[PDB]
Structure formats: structure tokens, C-alpha cells
Amino acid sequence: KTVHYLKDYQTPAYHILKTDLHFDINEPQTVVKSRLTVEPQRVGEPLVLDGSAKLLSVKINGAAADYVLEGETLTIAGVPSERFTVEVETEILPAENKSLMGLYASGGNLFTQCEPEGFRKITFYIDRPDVMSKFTTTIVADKKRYPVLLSNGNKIDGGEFSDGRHWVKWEDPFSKPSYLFALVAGDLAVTEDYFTTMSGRNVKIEFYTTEADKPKVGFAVESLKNAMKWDETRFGLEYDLDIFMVVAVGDFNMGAMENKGLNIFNTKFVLADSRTATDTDFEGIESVVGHEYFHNWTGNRVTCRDWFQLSLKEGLTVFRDQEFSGDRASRAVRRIENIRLLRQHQFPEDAGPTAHPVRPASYEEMNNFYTMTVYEKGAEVVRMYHTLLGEEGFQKGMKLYFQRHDGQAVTCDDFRAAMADANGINLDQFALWYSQAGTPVLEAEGRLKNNIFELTVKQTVPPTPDMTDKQPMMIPVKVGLLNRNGEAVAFDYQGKRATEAVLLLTEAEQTFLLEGVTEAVVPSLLRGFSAPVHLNYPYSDDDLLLLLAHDSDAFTRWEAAQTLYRRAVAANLATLSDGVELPKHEKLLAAVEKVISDDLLDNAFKALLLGVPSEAELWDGAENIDPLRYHQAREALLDTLAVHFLPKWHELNRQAAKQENQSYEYSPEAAGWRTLRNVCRAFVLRADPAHIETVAEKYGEMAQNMTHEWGILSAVNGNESDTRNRLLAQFADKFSDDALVMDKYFALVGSSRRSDTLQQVRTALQHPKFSLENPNKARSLIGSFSRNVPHFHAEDGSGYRFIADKVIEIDRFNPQVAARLVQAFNLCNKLEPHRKNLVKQALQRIRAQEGLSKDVGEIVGKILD
Ligand SMILES: N[C@@H](CCc1ccccc1)P(=O)(O)O
Ligand SMILES: [Zn+2]
């Protein structure tokens, strides 16, 4: 079983200077011919090409090569000592490609996905990102069937043939790794716009969609134009071609893809209108359109040496996309959402069997490393450079990075060195953020003696499956102090008098002296979530209420609420387990009443303060978990809050509706009110499930956009009324023609806490609009069921069996989807014995499948072995 190790990296023996491709598209086969111009680096080594397409011929300088093909590699032993050409002819059946990697069909059109190692499914090549070549691509096809023929770069020639066929030739002048190749052939509608760069050069913008989806592309176009302007104003980065194309595709494994000048997007991240897309969907488009555009510099112009460096482009591009969205609107709310995402999804990963460093030391299947750790913790790591260095110094680091490395394939170490060198600071210890897996745990204690607040802080990082030794890391802790009435208190550190400071923890244990303090204080700690850590400080319930009411930092106010909810859930667990009455939660209820009633709180921030941590956050750190017990305790808390404040939930909803003021289109302002409104609806329908018939009666009047339909349907989705079933059926009939709205129906089916979800999910498998072979559908229905705690973790094992059956079925055509699904079982070692036994059986049965993919195999072994 091949494992790839970062320690074994060696530069390539061969470079590829020029890559000329010819695609001859027919029914059913596409024949690909290449001409590669190959430059020896280590003369006399065998030429080894990666590839898995059907091989029809290979030549070296025009003569039939003597070669051997074994597995997915082709080797030619007798190669010239100087420049030579290699010609390879392959044949592909793209309508049989259900993996959606390489060249594949979708909606009668043809698309590619090459990142990370898809290009070798098209031709034989040196398919690694430190090999950068200049591509020119010729495409020939039936004109009526394939009128749009695209590939990267500039379109330099084209023509017609008498038999109905036409051709185009695309030249991309920038050297690139093979993972950034793209090709599209299809009958697609175009939407045209343009942007004029800071140097006065127009860039033609073209979005390609189906003819029916074209009216939903306008928000994405405007978001691209905003991202282009923003890279220029914030980073001083300008686009480098006079054309930028984006192509939407309904069958796609991930969100989008930054192929140079020809980005390919999942429909879900480009199409929206207010009738069919929620405000969250719009925000997603804005983030992801920016994200892919930001890759032009952070990924394309500067690339990755090897796949272990994935976070070099993804952490930094996520950071860029986060900063773009925060500059657009609602910076603090958006930051909290990001933190919440990290703690809900990335913390469990770092605590579990598949935990890995931001820059892994080894992998079996690289597709398994497109993770919350590489992306979201990666962005947190980039952000720490910003926190340490300031915006100006961070920009000096970026400028040096591009001066040094424009045109190169580089490492996380190079980025770190650029940050360090541009600012004249030593960041050697900072490398541990790349190499050390696990969430650091800070233990802190504070004392005000004399007029010094002495904050003592210890750090530790647990062993993870790859590594036991974890040394002290460089951790910035941003702090403030509140007095007895919650106003800010100034303090001295280090020779500066201010109301905030970044305390830099670099050792196992340190004491920080905040001097010149004249009042009794409670510290505010880890402001802005200044490092991706767990922090334990002994706070009283009154201290948490003070922080929530009065602290000036969003994160720490929201963390205080989160802590109160968590403590209440813990209290419920205790009573439920003793068979006694539920706690009163008198202080939490009083804090919540304050939030509800506070009219100076931003609407969307208010909604976050009223969100209860998820079950996985609640069982973080526990052993012998019974997921249903945590679910029960959380549900009891939500029911308490729903019922206790029912009339005030109705009132808040009404104030929010009045303020929304019939502005149903997307804007950050209107969205905030809708978000609050949807929190109220959830609570109302908890407390008074009968209110569903009153909703049903006025449904048309309430259904003024998808944010409202989604919010209502979400609110009632766990209701045992038949009316919940009728509303869902009517939703599926109304939007039957919109694939992205059908994804939403399937998600409601899969996520319901009603007792009869498993059978409704089984029926939905056979819905005319469901397709197991479509990643958006599979994820919506099955993926949602796998995260549906009461159903997935049912005591009878029915959930585990179902999900294991679908890993097995899906893995037969799409290992990437199946390997993402099988991670539903990651909690295995931490479950109570009865459920653990059943999960282990499910995983052994997956492992016993003949021909199980490497992708799913790798994850099952981490869990089981
Ligand atoms: N680089 C892209 C992810 C690539 C990908 C797409 C599909 C399958 C595997 C990897 P993003 O992170 O810009 O979205
Ligand atoms: Zn990316």
C-alpha cells in the first residue's frame, strides 16, 4: 500500500516546457493527443509518466517508443540527453466517468476536474505541481452539439470543417502545473460583463450556464467584480489576462475550482435569486467567487511544490476570502460565524482519529486532505501572522512573497520566511503551527495583587495519531479587563498604557504582568479568537453575565453566552441521568431575557447569541459518549427556552418583520433581520407546534423569498404533524424544476428529528429528482442523515447500517463522496460500548468489500486500526 511522505520529496528528473494538447470529441469517445517538450534535469533517468486513460500510442521524437505500462505509470528507459518530445494518444469515454475527476460528462456537456491528480486521467503526464509548463489546447467537436469550446487562456485561432465540426485553439501564456488545466465543451448560454483593472486594461468576464440557469448568475458576476476591485485595493494585486471565464456545473465533487482563467463552479456557488436562494446562499456565492478569484495570485501565480503544502494556497486563500467578506459587510458577525464553523467541524477532526497537521507529513490518498484542518485552521494560522504583524506588516510579507516566488512552486516554509524576513522578526517557533496537529489547551489563572493583574497561562497540546511530542507553540492571546460595571480598565504592558494588548505565550508556562490597575477586574481573554485554542479560565456565572452584557469584543461576548449554554446542557445531563426534574437555569434565563430585549444589539449578532452549541461541541473531550443523552439534554434546553419565552419570540419576530420592511432581495441589512426572524420561528414552533397550521394557512403570504420558505420549513421540520409532510411535498412540487432547491428538500428530509426519518429517507432515494450519482444530492439527503444525531446514532444500529450500506454503494462510482461520508463514523472510539460495537461492525463490513477504494480504505484504517 503506497504512502507518500513529505520527507521523501525530490525534485523531478524531467521538466515539461511545453504541453500541446489536441482533443477530438466524438460519440461516445474523445481521443486526446499530446506533444510534450521535455527537458532533462537528471540526464539518463527513466521517464516516468502518470496515467490511467486507455493508451493508444506513445512516441518519442516521432517514433514509436519502447515503453512499459504497469499500473498507472508509463516508463521509457531510453531517453535523449537533451530536449525531446513525447507524443501520447489516449482515449476517454467521458459519459462513463461517474467519479467526476478527469474529463466527464454532465447535463450533456463535458467538463474537467484536475485538482489534485485528475489530469493523469486524461493523458500521461508528469502530474505533480512542481512541474509547470506552458499549455496550448486544440479542441475539435460537432458544432451543433458542442458550440462552446473552452480551455485556459487566450483564444488564438479556430475554424470550421464541412462535415459539421468546428475547432478552437487556446493559448495560456503562463506556465502552470497540470492541476490547473481545464476544458469545457458544451451547449451553454453566456453572460458577459467586464472589469477595468487599475492599469486601465479591460478584462472581459464571461459566465457560462445552462440557458435556464442564466437569469440566476447576476449576483455572482457582481461579486466577481467586487473581488477584483478588492484584491487591487487591499492587496495591490491585479489580474493578468484580458479574459476571465466561469462555468457552472451541476455535477461536481466540491465547491469550485480556480483553473487559470477558466474557473469551474458547482451551481450552488454561482446561482441565486431571491425566490430560490437563501441569504446564506448569496453570502456563499460571494465568498466562493472571491475565493477562486483570489487563487489567481495565491495558488496560480505562486503554486505548491507538493501536495503536502496544500495549506500554502488554501489557508491563505480562505483567509483572503474571509477578509473580503468582512470588508464587504458585518465583519464581527462574519468572524464569529467562521469561529463557530471551526469549532464545530475542525475541532472534532483535531480530536479524532483522522487528525493531521496543517501540513501533513504523509498521505495515502491526497483527496482525503481537502479538510477543515488544511482550510479553516490553515486560515487561522495565516490570520495569526496578521495578528502578530499588523495589516501593514502582513502586506510587506505578501509583497516579499510575490517578489521572491512569482512563477514558482513553493512551501509553507517559504511563506513563513517571507513574513519573517519582510518584518525583520524571528518566526522559527511559528513553524510548529504547520507541523503539530491537535488543538492547544491553555490553562489560565489571574490574580490582582497590589495593582498588578498577574495572568498565569500554561499550554499543552495532546498527542495525535501521527505524533506524540508536542512542544510549546507561539500563541497570541489578546486581552482586556472589565471593572465591576463592565467598563474597560486601562493597564500597563509593556511600557504602554492601553485598554487591550496581545500577550504572546511562547513557553510551556508564563506569567504576564498587567500593571497600574486601580480597580477590581475580570479579564476578557482570547479576543477576536486570537489563536485557534481551547482556553480554560475559572469564570463564575456572574462573570460570564458581565462579559455578555458589557464586553466590547464580539467573540468574547458570544463565548460567554456559549459557556452559559454549555453549563446548562451539562446541568441537564446530570438531572436527566439522576431521574430528577430539570434545573431552573435561573441566571441563564435572565441573561437570555436581556439579549432578547436589548435593542442596541445588531440583529445578526443577537441571533448568534441565541444559538446553542451543537451536540459535538457539547461532547467534546468526553469518553463513552451516548449521543442520544447529549441530544436529549440539548433538546430540553431548547424546549425550555422555546416555552419560557414564547410570547417574546413572537414579539421579536414581529419587530424583525417590521424592520425588514418588505425588502426581500438580498442585502446584508435585510438578511440580518431575516436571520433573527428565523431564530424566532424555530423557537415558536418548538413551543407551539400547532402554530404550523396557522403558518400553513398564510404560507403564500409568508413565502416572500427562499430565506423565509427555508426558515419556516426548517422550523417545522421536526414537527410530528402531517402538515409538515404536506408542506415539504408542496415545496418539492413548487420547485421541482430547480435542482438547487431540490437539494434543500432532500436536506430537510435527511435532517428531520421526527421519528420516521429513516423510512422517509429511504423513500427519498427513489424520488424522481434524486440521483445518488450527483454529489449535491447525495450530500443533501445521505450526508444530512449521517449528521442527524438521533437517527444516525439510533441504538438499534439502523443508522450505522444505512450509512455503511451507502458508503459501499457510492464508493463503487465516487470514492471522494464515499470517503467524506464514512467520516460520519469518526466518533467510534469515543462511543459507549453498545454503539461502538455496532460502528466497528459497520466499518469492518466496509473494509471487507472487494475493490474498496484507497480513499475510503485510508479513512477506515485510521478509525479501526
Ligand atoms: N482548490 C479548490 C478545491 C479543489 C478541488 C475541487 C474538487 C475536487 C478536489 C479538489 P477550492 O478550494 O478553491 O475550492
Ligand atoms: Zn481553494
DSSP assignment of 203-256 equals EEEEEEE-TTTGGG-HHHHHHHHHHHHHHHHHH-----SSEEEEEEESS-SSSE
How many C-beta atoms lie closer than 10 Å to residue 834's C-beta? Answer: 10
Single-letter amino acid code for the residue at 223 = S
Ligand closest to the CA atom of residue 259: 1
Say how far apart CA 277 and CA 72 lie, in whole Å.
Answer: 43
Ligand closest to the CA atom of residue 816: 1
Single-letter amino acid code for the residue at 328 = R
Which of these, 697, 706, 683, lies nearest to 635 by C-alpha position?
Answer: 683
Residue of the CA atom closest to atom 2 of ligand 1: 257
> What residues flank ligand 1, with Cβ below 6 Å?
113, 115, 253-258, 291-292, 295, 314, 370
With residue 379 as reference, give the H or E element that holds it: helix 378-405
How many C-beta atoms lie closer than 10 Å to residue 315's C-beta? Answer: 28
Residue of the CA atom closest to atom 6 of ligand 1: 254
Contacts of 403 (CB under 8 A, 6+ apart): none
Residue of the CA atom closest to atom 3 of ligand 1: 257
Phi, psi at residue 200, to the nearest 5°?
Answer: 100, 15
How many C-beta atoms lie closer than 10 Å to residue 195's C-beta? Answer: 19
- Diameter over CA atoms, the chain: 93
- CA–centroid distance, 367 to ligand 1, in Å, is 9
Contacts of 853 (CB under 8 A, 6+ apart): 365, 811, 815, 818, 819
Say how far apart CA 177 and CA 19 lie, in whole Å.
Answer: 11
How many C-beta atoms lie closer than 10 Å to residue 327's C-beta? Answer: 13
Residue of the CA atom closest to atom 1 of ligand 1: 257
Look up cell 428538500; give the residue. Answer: 745
Fold of the CATH domain 11-188: Immunoglobulin-like (2.60.40)
Three-state SS for 475-512 is EEEEEEEECCCCCECCEECCCCEECCEEEEECCCEEEE
Query: C-alpha grid cell for residue 139?
Result: 479542441
- CA–centroid distance, 62 to ligand 2, in Å, is 39
Query: Which residues are annotated binding-site positions for Zn(2+)?
Result: 291, 295, 314
Give the residue range(s) of CATH 2.60.40.1840 domains in the chain.
Answer: 438-538
Residue of the CA atom closest to atom 5 of ligand 1: 115
Residue of the CA atom closest to atom 12 of ligand 1: 314
Helix ranges (DSSP H) in 782-832? 784-786, 789-792, 798-811, 815-821
Query: CB of 287 within 8 A of CB of 219?
Result: no
- CA–centroid distance, 114 to ligand 1, in Å, is 9
Ligand closest to the CA atom of residue 112: 1
Look up cell 496578521; give the residue. Answer: 386
Q: Pick the catalytic residue from 89, 258, 286, 292.
A: 292
Fold of the CATH domain 189-273: Zincin-like (3.30.2010)
Single-letter amino acid code for the residue at 609 = L
* 206 is annotated as an active-site residue: no
**For the CA of 255, the nearest atom of ligand 1:** 14
Query: CB of 243 within 8 A of CB of 132?
Result: no
Which of these, 556, 479, 560, lies nearest to 517 by C-alpha position?
Answer: 479
Give the residue range(s) of CATH 1.10.390.10 domains in the chain.
Answer: 274-437
Three-state SS for 660-683 is HCCCCCCCHHHHHHHHHHHHHHHH
Say how far apart CA 419 and CA 424 lie, in whole Å.
Answer: 9
Angle at 181 between CA 234 and CA 46, to 5 degrees: 120
Mutate to test the pocket of ligand 1, among 99, 115, 291 (most ligand atoms within 8 A of CB): 115
Fold of the CATH domain 274-437: Neutral Protease; domain 2 (1.10.390)
Give the residue range(s) of CATH 2.60.40.1730 domains in the chain.
Answer: 11-188
- CA–centroid distance, 822 to ligand 2, in Å, is 23
CATH of 438-538, one of 3.30.460.80, 2.60.40.1840, 3.90.230.10, 3.20.20.80: 2.60.40.1840
How many C-beta atoms lie closer than 10 Å to residue 282's C-beta? Answer: 23
Query: Which residues are annotated binding-site positions?
Result: 291, 295, 314
Say how far apart CA 25 and CA 38 lie, in whole Å.
Answer: 26
- CA–centroid distance, 288 to ligand 1, in Å, is 11
Count of all residues that appear for the chain in the document = 865
**For the CA of 292, the nearest atom of ligand 1:** 13
Query: CB of 38 within 8 A of CB of 47?
Result: yes
Look up cell 487562456; give the residue. Answer: 153
Angle at 156 between CA 151 and CA 158, to 5 degrees: 85
List the determination method.
X-ray
Give the residue range(s) of CATH 1.25.50.10 domains in the chain.
Answer: 539-865
Say how far apart CA 6 and CA 413 lie, in whole Å.
Answer: 13
With residue 591 as reference, give the H or E element that holds it: helix 586-597
CB-proximal residues (5 Å) to ion ligand 2: 314, 317
Single-letter amino acid code for the residue at 164 = G
**For the CA of 299, the nearest atom of ligand 1:** 1
- CA–centroid distance, 821 to ligand 1, in Å, is 17
Say how far apart CA 682 and CA 689 lie, in whole Å.
Answer: 10
Fold of the CATH domain 539-865: Zincin-like fold (1.25.50)
The DSSP code for 173 is -
